[PDB]
Amino acid sequence: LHKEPATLIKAIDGDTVKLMYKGQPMTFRLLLVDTPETKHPKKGVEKYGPEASAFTKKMVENAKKVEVEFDKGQRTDKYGRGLAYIYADGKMVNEALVRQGLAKVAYVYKPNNTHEQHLRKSEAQAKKEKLNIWS
């Protein structure tokens, strides 16, 4: 797995950000995590949705460097979105959301499952600390 540079274009939601990658604007979906959404699904703005959304936005906006890391399997989903691990100054946004109780680990589709265990370990810690979603 290798990291590649990208430039923030705009954060869209807790789990979705628009990036300039290899010269093209592209929407990326964060691999392996489900955040509450301000979009769907569902019921509009779910609980912790605006929180999760502000966390991702602050984290990518304030970064010096954003990098994307594709997993071993398909790199786009059926909506045309890039599927990847996103890093802000070396820190994985997907893990930070989970470590803060602002995301749960998604249903995993192999072989896009490289960081699955790492994330699950963070999710376990956030539950034990009863943060946000877990409170």
mmCIF file with all atom_site columns, C-alpha atoms in Angstrom:
data_model
loop_
_atom_site.group_PDB
_atom_site.id
_atom_site.type_symbol
_atom_site.label_atom_id
_atom_site.label_alt_id
_atom_site.label_comp_id
_atom_site.label_asym_id
_atom_site.label_entity_id
_atom_site.label_seq_id
_atom_site.pdbx_PDB_ins_code
_atom_site.Cartn_x
_atom_site.Cartn_y
_atom_site.Cartn_z
_atom_site.occupancy
_atom_site.B_iso_or_equiv
_atom_site.pdbx_formal_charge
_atom_site.auth_seq_id
_atom_site.auth_comp_id
_atom_site.auth_asym_id
_atom_site.auth_atom_id
_atom_site.pdbx_PDB_model_num
ATOM 1   C CA . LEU A 1 1   ? 0.000   0.000  0.000   1.00 0.00 ? 1   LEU A CA 1
ATOM 2   C CA . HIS A 1 2   ? 1.408   3.431  -0.820  1.00 0.00 ? 2   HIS A CA 1
ATOM 3   C CA . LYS A 1 3   ? 0.367   6.971  0.014   1.00 0.00 ? 3   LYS A CA 1
ATOM 4   C CA . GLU A 1 4   ? -0.133  9.549  -2.745  1.00 0.00 ? 4   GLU A CA 1
ATOM 5   C CA . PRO A 1 5   ? -0.526  13.322 -2.472  1.00 0.00 ? 5   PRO A CA 1
ATOM 6   C CA . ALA A 1 6   ? -3.807  15.107 -3.091  1.00 0.00 ? 6   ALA A CA 1
ATOM 7   C CA . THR A 1 7   ? -5.233  18.588 -2.530  1.00 0.00 ? 7   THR A CA 1
ATOM 8   C CA . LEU A 1 8   ? -8.391  19.359 -0.575  1.00 0.00 ? 8   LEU A CA 1
ATOM 9   C CA . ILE A 1 9   ? -11.159 20.816 -2.686  1.00 0.00 ? 9   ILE A CA 1
ATOM 10  C CA . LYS A 1 10  ? -13.952 20.662 -0.144  1.00 0.00 ? 10  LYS A CA 1
ATOM 11  C CA . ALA A 1 11  ? -15.217 18.528 2.707   1.00 0.00 ? 11  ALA A CA 1
ATOM 12  C CA . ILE A 1 12  ? -18.722 17.266 1.966   1.00 0.00 ? 12  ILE A CA 1
ATOM 13  C CA . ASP A 1 13  ? -19.633 15.180 4.995   1.00 0.00 ? 13  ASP A CA 1
ATOM 14  C CA . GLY A 1 14  ? -18.156 13.184 7.841   1.00 0.00 ? 14  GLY A CA 1
ATOM 15  C CA . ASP A 1 15  ? -17.338 10.325 5.469   1.00 0.00 ? 15  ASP A CA 1
ATOM 16  C CA . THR A 1 16  ? -16.891 12.149 2.200   1.00 0.00 ? 16  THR A CA 1
ATOM 17  C CA . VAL A 1 17  ? -14.414 14.685 0.891   1.00 0.00 ? 17  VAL A CA 1
ATOM 18  C CA . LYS A 1 18  ? -13.732 16.182 -2.543  1.00 0.00 ? 18  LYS A CA 1
ATOM 19  C CA . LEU A 1 19  ? -10.047 16.086 -3.526  1.00 0.00 ? 19  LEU A CA 1
ATOM 20  C CA . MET A 1 20  ? -7.830  17.019 -6.464  1.00 0.00 ? 20  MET A CA 1
ATOM 21  C CA . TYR A 1 21  ? -6.091  13.749 -7.252  1.00 0.00 ? 21  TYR A CA 1
ATOM 22  C CA . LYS A 1 22  ? -3.607  13.298 -10.099 1.00 0.00 ? 22  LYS A CA 1
ATOM 23  C CA . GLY A 1 23  ? -5.018  16.447 -11.649 1.00 0.00 ? 23  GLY A CA 1
ATOM 24  C CA . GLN A 1 24  ? -8.710  15.654 -11.435 1.00 0.00 ? 24  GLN A CA 1
ATOM 25  C CA . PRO A 1 25  ? -11.389 16.648 -8.938  1.00 0.00 ? 25  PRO A CA 1
ATOM 26  C CA . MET A 1 26  ? -12.782 13.428 -7.437  1.00 0.00 ? 26  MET A CA 1
ATOM 27  C CA . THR A 1 27  ? -15.117 12.599 -4.557  1.00 0.00 ? 27  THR A CA 1
ATOM 28  C CA . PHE A 1 28  ? -13.586 10.174 -2.047  1.00 0.00 ? 28  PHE A CA 1
ATOM 29  C CA . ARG A 1 29  ? -15.594 8.023  0.384   1.00 0.00 ? 29  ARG A CA 1
ATOM 30  C CA . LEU A 1 30  ? -13.556 7.136  3.520   1.00 0.00 ? 30  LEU A CA 1
ATOM 31  C CA . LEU A 1 31  ? -12.892 3.361  3.576   1.00 0.00 ? 31  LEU A CA 1
ATOM 32  C CA . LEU A 1 32  ? -14.204 1.125  6.376   1.00 0.00 ? 32  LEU A CA 1
ATOM 33  C CA . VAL A 1 33  ? -16.085 3.677  8.432   1.00 0.00 ? 33  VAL A CA 1
ATOM 34  C CA . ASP A 1 34  ? -19.672 4.816  8.799   1.00 0.00 ? 34  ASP A CA 1
ATOM 35  C CA . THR A 1 35  ? -20.255 8.279  10.242  1.00 0.00 ? 35  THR A CA 1
ATOM 36  C CA . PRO A 1 36  ? -23.596 9.708  11.154  1.00 0.00 ? 36  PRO A CA 1
ATOM 37  C CA . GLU A 1 37  ? -24.691 11.732 8.129   1.00 0.00 ? 37  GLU A CA 1
ATOM 38  C CA . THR A 1 38  ? -25.913 15.224 7.476   1.00 0.00 ? 38  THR A CA 1
ATOM 39  C CA . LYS A 1 39  ? -27.061 13.789 4.158   1.00 0.00 ? 39  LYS A CA 1
ATOM 40  C CA . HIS A 1 40  ? -28.464 10.246 3.744   1.00 0.00 ? 40  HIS A CA 1
ATOM 41  C CA . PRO A 1 41  ? -29.041 7.728  4.975   1.00 0.00 ? 41  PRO A CA 1
ATOM 42  C CA . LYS A 1 42  ? -31.022 8.779  6.698   1.00 0.00 ? 42  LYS A CA 1
ATOM 43  C CA . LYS A 1 43  ? -33.675 10.988 8.328   1.00 0.00 ? 43  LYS A CA 1
ATOM 44  C CA . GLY A 1 44  ? -31.620 13.979 7.103   1.00 0.00 ? 44  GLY A CA 1
ATOM 45  C CA . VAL A 1 45  ? -29.133 15.153 9.737   1.00 0.00 ? 45  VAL A CA 1
ATOM 46  C CA . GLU A 1 46  ? -28.499 12.243 12.112  1.00 0.00 ? 46  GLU A CA 1
ATOM 47  C CA . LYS A 1 47  ? -27.267 12.620 15.687  1.00 0.00 ? 47  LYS A CA 1
ATOM 48  C CA . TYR A 1 48  ? -23.495 13.356 15.742  1.00 0.00 ? 48  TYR A CA 1
ATOM 49  C CA . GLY A 1 49  ? -23.686 13.966 11.999  1.00 0.00 ? 49  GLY A CA 1
ATOM 50  C CA . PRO A 1 50  ? -22.813 17.675 12.257  1.00 0.00 ? 50  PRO A CA 1
ATOM 51  C CA . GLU A 1 51  ? -20.099 16.791 14.771  1.00 0.00 ? 51  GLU A CA 1
ATOM 52  C CA . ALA A 1 52  ? -18.529 14.096 12.590  1.00 0.00 ? 52  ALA A CA 1
ATOM 53  C CA . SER A 1 53  ? -18.843 16.408 9.686   1.00 0.00 ? 53  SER A CA 1
ATOM 54  C CA . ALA A 1 54  ? -17.075 19.288 11.464  1.00 0.00 ? 54  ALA A CA 1
ATOM 55  C CA . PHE A 1 55  ? -14.320 16.957 12.633  1.00 0.00 ? 55  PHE A CA 1
ATOM 56  C CA . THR A 1 56  ? -13.399 15.711 9.150   1.00 0.00 ? 56  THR A CA 1
ATOM 57  C CA . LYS A 1 57  ? -13.590 19.249 7.707   1.00 0.00 ? 57  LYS A CA 1
ATOM 58  C CA . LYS A 1 58  ? -11.337 20.803 10.421  1.00 0.00 ? 58  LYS A CA 1
ATOM 59  C CA . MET A 1 59  ? -8.882  17.943 10.122  1.00 0.00 ? 59  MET A CA 1
ATOM 60  C CA . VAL A 1 60  ? -8.411  18.146 6.355   1.00 0.00 ? 60  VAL A CA 1
ATOM 61  C CA . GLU A 1 61  ? -8.703  21.913 6.153   1.00 0.00 ? 61  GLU A CA 1
ATOM 62  C CA . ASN A 1 62  ? -5.968  22.567 8.707   1.00 0.00 ? 62  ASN A CA 1
ATOM 63  C CA . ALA A 1 63  ? -3.526  20.071 7.242   1.00 0.00 ? 63  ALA A CA 1
ATOM 64  C CA . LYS A 1 64  ? -0.235  20.956 5.531   1.00 0.00 ? 64  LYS A CA 1
ATOM 65  C CA . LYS A 1 65  ? -0.398  17.745 3.522   1.00 0.00 ? 65  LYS A CA 1
ATOM 66  C CA . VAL A 1 66  ? -3.332  15.498 2.542   1.00 0.00 ? 66  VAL A CA 1
ATOM 67  C CA . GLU A 1 67  ? -2.517  12.042 1.187   1.00 0.00 ? 67  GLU A CA 1
ATOM 68  C CA . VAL A 1 68  ? -4.725  9.269  -0.133  1.00 0.00 ? 68  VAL A CA 1
ATOM 69  C CA . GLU A 1 69  ? -4.017  5.574  0.246   1.00 0.00 ? 69  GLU A CA 1
ATOM 70  C CA . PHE A 1 70  ? -6.004  3.055  -1.883  1.00 0.00 ? 70  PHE A CA 1
ATOM 71  C CA . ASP A 1 71  ? -6.456  -0.469 -0.501  1.00 0.00 ? 71  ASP A CA 1
ATOM 72  C CA . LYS A 1 72  ? -5.762  -3.715 -2.454  1.00 0.00 ? 72  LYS A CA 1
ATOM 73  C CA . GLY A 1 73  ? -9.218  -4.083 -4.079  1.00 0.00 ? 73  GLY A CA 1
ATOM 74  C CA . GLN A 1 74  ? -11.537 -1.925 -6.153  1.00 0.00 ? 74  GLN A CA 1
ATOM 75  C CA . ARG A 1 75  ? -10.635 1.754  -5.979  1.00 0.00 ? 75  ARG A CA 1
ATOM 76  C CA . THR A 1 76  ? -14.014 3.291  -6.804  1.00 0.00 ? 76  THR A CA 1
ATOM 77  C CA . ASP A 1 77  ? -17.560 2.400  -5.681  1.00 0.00 ? 77  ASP A CA 1
ATOM 78  C CA . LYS A 1 78  ? -20.699 2.305  -7.810  1.00 0.00 ? 78  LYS A CA 1
ATOM 79  C CA . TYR A 1 79  ? -21.182 6.081  -7.439  1.00 0.00 ? 79  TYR A CA 1
ATOM 80  C CA . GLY A 1 80  ? -17.902 6.956  -9.015  1.00 0.00 ? 80  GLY A CA 1
ATOM 81  C CA . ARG A 1 81  ? -16.354 7.712  -5.625  1.00 0.00 ? 81  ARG A CA 1
ATOM 82  C CA . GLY A 1 82  ? -12.727 6.926  -4.748  1.00 0.00 ? 82  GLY A CA 1
ATOM 83  C CA . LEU A 1 83  ? -12.374 4.407  -1.894  1.00 0.00 ? 83  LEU A CA 1
ATOM 84  C CA . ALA A 1 84  ? -9.409  5.186  0.298   1.00 0.00 ? 84  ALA A CA 1
ATOM 85  C CA . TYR A 1 85  ? -7.724  5.884  3.611   1.00 0.00 ? 85  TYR A CA 1
ATOM 86  C CA . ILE A 1 86  ? -7.202  9.609  3.911   1.00 0.00 ? 86  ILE A CA 1
ATOM 87  C CA . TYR A 1 87  ? -4.240  11.079 5.863   1.00 0.00 ? 87  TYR A CA 1
ATOM 88  C CA . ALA A 1 88  ? -3.908  14.652 7.224   1.00 0.00 ? 88  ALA A CA 1
ATOM 89  C CA . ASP A 1 89  ? -0.262  15.368 8.122   1.00 0.00 ? 89  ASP A CA 1
ATOM 90  C CA . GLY A 1 90  ? 0.434   11.670 8.592   1.00 0.00 ? 90  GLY A CA 1
ATOM 91  C CA . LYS A 1 91  ? -2.688  10.998 10.690  1.00 0.00 ? 91  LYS A CA 1
ATOM 92  C CA . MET A 1 92  ? -5.403  8.759  9.276   1.00 0.00 ? 92  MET A CA 1
ATOM 93  C CA . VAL A 1 93  ? -8.716  10.614 9.224   1.00 0.00 ? 93  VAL A CA 1
ATOM 94  C CA . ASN A 1 94  ? -10.620 7.336  9.167   1.00 0.00 ? 94  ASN A CA 1
ATOM 95  C CA . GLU A 1 95  ? -9.021  6.156  12.414  1.00 0.00 ? 95  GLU A CA 1
ATOM 96  C CA . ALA A 1 96  ? -9.336  9.508  14.154  1.00 0.00 ? 96  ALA A CA 1
ATOM 97  C CA . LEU A 1 97  ? -13.084 9.568  13.580  1.00 0.00 ? 97  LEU A CA 1
ATOM 98  C CA . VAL A 1 98  ? -13.396 6.080  14.997  1.00 0.00 ? 98  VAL A CA 1
ATOM 99  C CA . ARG A 1 99  ? -11.080 6.771  17.928  1.00 0.00 ? 99  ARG A CA 1
ATOM 100 C CA . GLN A 1 100 ? -13.323 9.776  18.837  1.00 0.00 ? 100 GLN A CA 1
ATOM 101 C CA . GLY A 1 101 ? -16.583 7.813  18.770  1.00 0.00 ? 101 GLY A CA 1
ATOM 102 C CA . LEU A 1 102 ? -17.680 9.780  15.694  1.00 0.00 ? 102 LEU A CA 1
ATOM 103 C CA . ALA A 1 103 ? -17.804 6.772  13.344  1.00 0.00 ? 103 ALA A CA 1
ATOM 104 C CA . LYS A 1 104 ? -18.347 3.012  13.562  1.00 0.00 ? 104 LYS A CA 1
ATOM 105 C CA . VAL A 1 105 ? -16.306 0.440  11.576  1.00 0.00 ? 105 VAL A CA 1
ATOM 106 C CA . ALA A 1 106 ? -18.364 -0.398 8.434   1.00 0.00 ? 106 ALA A CA 1
ATOM 107 C CA . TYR A 1 107 ? -19.344 -3.792 7.041   1.00 0.00 ? 107 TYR A CA 1
ATOM 108 C CA . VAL A 1 108 ? -16.102 -4.941 5.450   1.00 0.00 ? 108 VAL A CA 1
ATOM 109 C CA . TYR A 1 109 ? -15.750 -6.073 1.858   1.00 0.00 ? 109 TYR A CA 1
ATOM 110 C CA . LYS A 1 110 ? -12.537 -7.969 1.268   1.00 0.00 ? 110 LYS A CA 1
ATOM 111 C CA . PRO A 1 111 ? -10.032 -7.446 0.022   1.00 0.00 ? 111 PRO A CA 1
ATOM 112 C CA . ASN A 1 112 ? -10.468 -3.754 0.941   1.00 0.00 ? 112 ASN A CA 1
ATOM 113 C CA . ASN A 1 113 ? -9.786  -4.564 4.560   1.00 0.00 ? 113 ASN A CA 1
ATOM 114 C CA . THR A 1 114 ? -6.110  -3.844 5.226   1.00 0.00 ? 114 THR A CA 1
ATOM 115 C CA . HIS A 1 115 ? -6.599  -1.501 8.208   1.00 0.00 ? 115 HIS A CA 1
ATOM 116 C CA . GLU A 1 116 ? -9.627  -3.345 9.542   1.00 0.00 ? 116 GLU A CA 1
ATOM 117 C CA . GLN A 1 117 ? -8.096  -4.597 12.780  1.00 0.00 ? 117 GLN A CA 1
ATOM 118 C CA . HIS A 1 118 ? -6.403  -1.280 13.612  1.00 0.00 ? 118 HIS A CA 1
ATOM 119 C CA . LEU A 1 119 ? -9.710  0.486  13.267  1.00 0.00 ? 119 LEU A CA 1
ATOM 120 C CA . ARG A 1 120 ? -11.545 -2.121 15.279  1.00 0.00 ? 120 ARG A CA 1
ATOM 121 C CA . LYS A 1 121 ? -8.997  -1.650 18.096  1.00 0.00 ? 121 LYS A CA 1
ATOM 122 C CA . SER A 1 122 ? -9.736  2.103  18.064  1.00 0.00 ? 122 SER A CA 1
ATOM 123 C CA . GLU A 1 123 ? -13.442 1.484  17.994  1.00 0.00 ? 123 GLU A CA 1
ATOM 124 C CA . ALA A 1 124 ? -13.119 -0.788 21.061  1.00 0.00 ? 124 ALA A CA 1
ATOM 125 C CA . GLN A 1 125 ? -11.237 1.976  22.927  1.00 0.00 ? 125 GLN A CA 1
ATOM 126 C CA . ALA A 1 126 ? -13.787 4.632  22.041  1.00 0.00 ? 126 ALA A CA 1
ATOM 127 C CA . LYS A 1 127 ? -16.637 2.408  23.319  1.00 0.00 ? 127 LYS A CA 1
ATOM 128 C CA . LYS A 1 128 ? -14.772 1.703  26.559  1.00 0.00 ? 128 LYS A CA 1
ATOM 129 C CA . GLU A 1 129 ? -14.295 5.476  26.965  1.00 0.00 ? 129 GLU A CA 1
ATOM 130 C CA . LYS A 1 130 ? -17.950 5.957  26.052  1.00 0.00 ? 130 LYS A CA 1
ATOM 131 C CA . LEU A 1 131 ? -17.227 8.762  23.590  1.00 0.00 ? 131 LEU A CA 1
ATOM 132 C CA . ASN A 1 132 ? -19.949 10.486 21.530  1.00 0.00 ? 132 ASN A CA 1
ATOM 133 C CA . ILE A 1 133 ? -21.787 7.752  19.616  1.00 0.00 ? 133 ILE A CA 1
ATOM 134 C CA . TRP A 1 134 ? -20.984 5.480  22.552  1.00 0.00 ? 134 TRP A CA 1
ATOM 135 C CA . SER A 1 135 ? -22.329 7.823  25.225  1.00 0.00 ? 135 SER A CA 1
#
